[PDB]
Amino acid sequence: GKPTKRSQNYAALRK
Amino acid sequence: GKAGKPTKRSQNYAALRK
RNA sequence: AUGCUCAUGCACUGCAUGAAUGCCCCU
RNA sequence: AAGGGAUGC
Ligand SMILES: [Br-]
């Protein structure tokens, strides 16, 4: 659904 | 580029993980 | 498009909370 | 995209 600290954090290290 | 689904064991392990 | 996934909380829907063991082996 | 394993000595 919406971004979360966890998913966001993942996206970062993941980016 | 991969995901991995948390299972009953993985989660159980983590639950016990302090 | 992790803008997920998956648990737990009196519809494969909400809400809230937590987990990168969300591993590693295998079939 | 499905299943199993803590003897995962
Ligand atoms: Br295998």
Side-chain angles (χ1 to χ4, degrees), chain B residues 1 3-7 9-14:
Chain B
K5 285 207 209 278
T7 75
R9 23 164 19 92
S10 87
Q11 287 177 170
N12 164 72
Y13 188 97

PDB file of all heavy atoms in Angstrom, chain B residues 1-14, unseen atoms left out:
ATOM      1  N   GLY B   1      18.142  -7.944  -6.460  1.00  0.00           N
ATOM      2  CA  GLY B   1      16.961  -8.098  -7.363  1.00  0.00           C
ATOM      3  C   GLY B   1      16.071  -9.277  -6.993  1.00  0.00           C
ATOM      4  O   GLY B   1      15.408  -9.834  -7.871  1.00  0.00           O
ATOM      5  N   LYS B   2      16.052  -9.656  -5.712  1.00  0.00           N
ATOM      6  CA  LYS B   2      15.236 -10.775  -5.237  1.00  0.00           C
ATOM      7  C   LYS B   2      14.481 -10.401  -3.959  1.00  0.00           C
ATOM      8  O   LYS B   2      14.869  -9.467  -3.261  1.00  0.00           O
ATOM      9  CB  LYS B   2      16.123 -12.000  -4.993  1.00  0.00           C
ATOM     10  N   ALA B   3      13.434 -11.154  -3.620  1.00  0.00           N
ATOM     11  CA  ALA B   3      12.662 -10.857  -2.408  1.00  0.00           C
ATOM     12  C   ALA B   3      12.802 -11.771  -1.161  1.00  0.00           C
ATOM     13  O   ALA B   3      13.330 -11.328  -0.141  1.00  0.00           O
ATOM     14  CB  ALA B   3      11.192 -10.656  -2.771  1.00  0.00           C
ATOM     15  N   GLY B   4      12.330 -13.018  -1.241  1.00  0.00           N
ATOM     16  CA  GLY B   4      12.400 -13.990  -0.129  1.00  0.00           C
ATOM     17  C   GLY B   4      11.174 -13.863   0.797  1.00  0.00           C
ATOM     18  O   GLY B   4      10.987 -12.810   1.417  1.00  0.00           O
ATOM     19  N   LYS B   5      10.327 -14.888   0.901  1.00  0.00           N
ATOM     20  CA  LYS B   5       9.155 -14.771   1.783  1.00  0.00           C
ATOM     21  C   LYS B   5       9.379 -15.253   3.203  1.00  0.00           C
ATOM     22  O   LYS B   5       9.819 -16.371   3.408  1.00  0.00           O
ATOM     23  CB  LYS B   5       7.958 -15.560   1.236  1.00  0.00           C
ATOM     24  CG  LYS B   5       7.225 -14.943   0.045  1.00  0.00           C
ATOM     25  CD  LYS B   5       5.754 -15.370  -0.003  1.00  0.00           C
ATOM     26  CE  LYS B   5       5.240 -15.395  -1.452  1.00  0.00           C
ATOM     27  NZ  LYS B   5       4.821 -14.059  -2.004  1.00  0.00           N
ATOM     28  N   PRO B   6       9.082 -14.438   4.202  1.00  0.00           N
ATOM     29  CA  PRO B   6       9.293 -14.886   5.575  1.00  0.00           C
ATOM     30  C   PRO B   6       8.305 -16.027   5.787  1.00  0.00           C
ATOM     31  O   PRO B   6       7.149 -15.898   5.404  1.00  0.00           O
ATOM     32  CB  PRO B   6       8.908 -13.679   6.427  1.00  0.00           C
ATOM     33  CG  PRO B   6       8.524 -12.593   5.519  1.00  0.00           C
ATOM     34  CD  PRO B   6       8.536 -13.076   4.122  1.00  0.00           C
ATOM     35  N   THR B   7       8.786 -17.120   6.367  1.00  0.00           N
ATOM     36  CA  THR B   7       8.033 -18.333   6.671  1.00  0.00           C
ATOM     37  C   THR B   7       7.799 -18.466   8.175  1.00  0.00           C
ATOM     38  O   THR B   7       8.099 -17.563   8.939  1.00  0.00           O
ATOM     39  CB  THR B   7       8.876 -19.522   6.276  1.00  0.00           C
ATOM     40  OG1 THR B   7       9.915 -19.672   7.257  1.00  0.00           O
ATOM     41  CG2 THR B   7       9.639 -19.267   5.001  1.00  0.00           C
ATOM     42  N   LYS B   8       7.290 -19.616   8.602  1.00  0.00           N
ATOM     43  CA  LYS B   8       7.029 -19.844  10.010  1.00  0.00           C
ATOM     44  C   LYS B   8       8.330 -19.986  10.762  1.00  0.00           C
ATOM     45  O   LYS B   8       8.425 -19.521  11.904  1.00  0.00           O
ATOM     46  CB  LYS B   8       6.181 -21.087  10.216  1.00  0.00           C
ATOM     47  N   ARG B   9       9.334 -20.605  10.130  1.00  0.00           N
ATOM     48  CA  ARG B   9      10.635 -20.784  10.792  1.00  0.00           C
ATOM     49  C   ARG B   9      11.389 -19.485  10.853  1.00  0.00           C
ATOM     50  O   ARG B   9      11.822 -19.063  11.926  1.00  0.00           O
ATOM     51  CB  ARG B   9      11.527 -21.861  10.172  1.00  0.00           C
ATOM     52  CG  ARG B   9      11.255 -22.199   8.758  1.00  0.00           C
ATOM     53  CD  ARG B   9      12.381 -22.966   8.084  1.00  0.00           C
ATOM     54  NE  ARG B   9      13.328 -23.611   9.001  1.00  0.00           N
ATOM     55  CZ  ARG B   9      13.243 -24.860   9.454  1.00  0.00           C
ATOM     56  NH1 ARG B   9      12.221 -25.641   9.106  1.00  0.00           N
ATOM     57  NH2 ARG B   9      14.187 -25.327  10.262  1.00  0.00           N
ATOM     58  N   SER B  10      11.541 -18.846   9.705  1.00  0.00           N
ATOM     59  CA  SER B  10      12.254 -17.588   9.671  1.00  0.00           C
ATOM     60  C   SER B  10      11.695 -16.657  10.744  1.00  0.00           C
ATOM     61  O   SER B  10      12.429 -16.176  11.598  1.00  0.00           O
ATOM     62  CB  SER B  10      12.154 -16.986   8.286  1.00  0.00           C
ATOM     63  OG  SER B  10      10.997 -16.188   8.126  1.00  0.00           O
ATOM     64  N   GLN B  11      10.382 -16.451  10.729  1.00  0.00           N
ATOM     65  CA  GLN B  11       9.726 -15.585  11.696  1.00  0.00           C
ATOM     66  C   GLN B  11       9.932 -16.083  13.120  1.00  0.00           C
ATOM     67  O   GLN B  11      10.263 -15.282  14.014  1.00  0.00           O
ATOM     68  CB  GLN B  11       8.258 -15.407  11.347  1.00  0.00           C
ATOM     69  CG  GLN B  11       8.070 -14.492  10.133  1.00  0.00           C
ATOM     70  CD  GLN B  11       6.611 -14.303   9.668  1.00  0.00           C
ATOM     71  OE1 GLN B  11       6.358 -13.446   8.824  1.00  0.00           O
ATOM     72  NE2 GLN B  11       5.677 -15.095  10.195  1.00  0.00           N
ATOM     73  N   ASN B  12       9.769 -17.395  13.331  1.00  0.00           N
ATOM     74  CA  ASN B  12       9.945 -17.953  14.656  1.00  0.00           C
ATOM     75  C   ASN B  12      11.353 -17.647  15.155  1.00  0.00           C
ATOM     76  O   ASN B  12      11.529 -17.237  16.289  1.00  0.00           O
ATOM     77  CB  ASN B  12       9.703 -19.443  14.671  1.00  0.00           C
ATOM     78  CG  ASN B  12      10.244 -20.095  15.928  1.00  0.00           C
ATOM     79  OD1 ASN B  12       9.704 -19.937  17.042  1.00  0.00           O
ATOM     80  ND2 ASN B  12      11.339 -20.817  15.766  1.00  0.00           N
ATOM     81  N   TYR B  13      12.351 -17.840  14.303  1.00  0.00           N
ATOM     82  CA  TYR B  13      13.727 -17.582  14.673  1.00  0.00           C
ATOM     83  C   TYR B  13      13.837 -16.133  15.126  1.00  0.00           C
ATOM     84  O   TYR B  13      14.272 -15.838  16.233  1.00  0.00           O
ATOM     85  CB  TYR B  13      14.641 -17.837  13.481  1.00  0.00           C
ATOM     86  CG  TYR B  13      16.097 -17.775  13.827  1.00  0.00           C
ATOM     87  CD1 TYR B  13      16.823 -18.939  14.092  1.00  0.00           C
ATOM     88  CD2 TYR B  13      16.760 -16.559  13.909  1.00  0.00           C
ATOM     89  CE1 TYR B  13      18.168 -18.891  14.432  1.00  0.00           C
ATOM     90  CE2 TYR B  13      18.105 -16.504  14.248  1.00  0.00           C
ATOM     91  CZ  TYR B  13      18.796 -17.671  14.507  1.00  0.00           C
ATOM     92  OH  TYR B  13      20.123 -17.612  14.833  1.00  0.00           O
ATOM     93  N   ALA B  14      13.383 -15.228  14.273  1.00  0.00           N
ATOM     94  CA  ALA B  14      13.425 -13.799  14.575  1.00  0.00           C
ATOM     95  C   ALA B  14      12.698 -13.418  15.830  1.00  0.00           C
ATOM     96  O   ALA B  14      13.141 -12.529  16.545  1.00  0.00           O
ATOM     97  CB  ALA B  14      12.876 -12.987  13.427  1.00  0.00           C
TER      98      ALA B  14
END
